[PDB]
From Swiss-Prot:
Assembly notes: Homodimer. Interacts with E2F1. Interacts with (acetylated) STAT3; promoting STAT3 recruitment to chromatin. Interacts with CTCF; promoting BRD2 recruitment to chromatin. (Microbial infection) Interacts with herpes virus 8 protein LANA1.
Note: Some specific inhibitors of BRD2 that prevent binding to acetylated histone are promising therapeutic molecules for the treatment of cancers or inflammatory diseases. ABBV-744, a small molecule, has been tested on tumors with success: ABBV-744 antiproliferative activity is mainly restricted to cell lines of acute myeloid leukaemia and prostate cancer and is able to displace BRD4 from chromatin. GSK046 (iBET-BD2), which specifically inhibits the second bromo domain, is a promising therapeutic small molecule for the treatment of inflammatory and autoimmune diseases.
Effect of residue 38 to A: Reduced binding to histone H4 acetylated at 'Lys-12' (H4K12ac)
Protein name, UniProt field: Bromodomain-containing protein 2
Species of origin: Homo sapiens
Family, per entry: Belongs to the BET family.
Phenotype for residue 33 to A: Abolished binding to histone H4 acetylated at 'Lys-12' (H4K12ac)
Residues of the full protein shown: 344 to 455 of 801
Record's comment describing the protein's domains: The first bromo domain specifically recognizes histone H4 acetylated at 'Lys-12' (H4K12ac). It also specifically binds histone H4 acetyl-methylated at 'Lys-5' and 'Lys-12' (H4K5acme and H4K12acme, respectively). The second bromo domain recognizes and binds histone H4 acetylated at 'Lys-5' and 'Lys-12' (H4K5ac and H4K12ac, respectively).
Localization, UniProt: Nucleus; Chromosome
Role, per record: Chromatin reader protein that specifically recognizes and binds histone H4 acetylated at 'Lys-5' and 'Lys-12' (H4K5ac and H4K12ac, respectively), thereby controlling gene expression and remodeling chromatin structures. Recruits transcription factors and coactivators to target gene sites, and activates RNA polymerase II machinery for transcriptional elongation.
Domain of life: Eukaryota
Length: 112
């Protein structure tokens, strides 16, 4: 029930990533990628392990993370799938990078 101090820190990061301050570049990450809606041909063949913020949020709220490294692994997977699928000049890759900079910096500030 009670998050560890490290996971509480991670829950703060999640709240920040979902906050209106970042909404102009965070929105593609709010729900699972809808490959048909985006015309992302073969998305689910190339990306074997989809991830997004609603899934990280559900895992956090259900107290399913066992440690902070698992949280970071999911958030990094979300960004990596984006980079993996898309070309470097795609608008979504720029948005991913802006959001990942928020993540990586705040994650680094996690209490030992």
């Amino acid at each position: 029930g009670k998050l560890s101090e490290q996971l509480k820190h991670c829950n703060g990061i999640l709240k920040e990533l979902l906050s209106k301050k970042h909404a102009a570049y965070a929105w593609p990450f709010y729900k699972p990628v809808d490959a048909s809606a985006l015309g992302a041909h073969d998305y689910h063949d190339i990306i074997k392990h989809p991830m997004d913020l609603s899934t990280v949020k559900r895992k956090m709220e259900n107290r399913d993370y066992r440690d902070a490294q698992e949280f970071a692994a999911d958030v990094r997977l979300m960004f990596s799938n984006c980079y993996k699928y898309n070309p470097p000049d795609h608008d979504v890759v720029a948005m991913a990078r802006k959001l990942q900079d928020v993540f990586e910096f705040r994650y680094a500030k996690m209490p030992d």
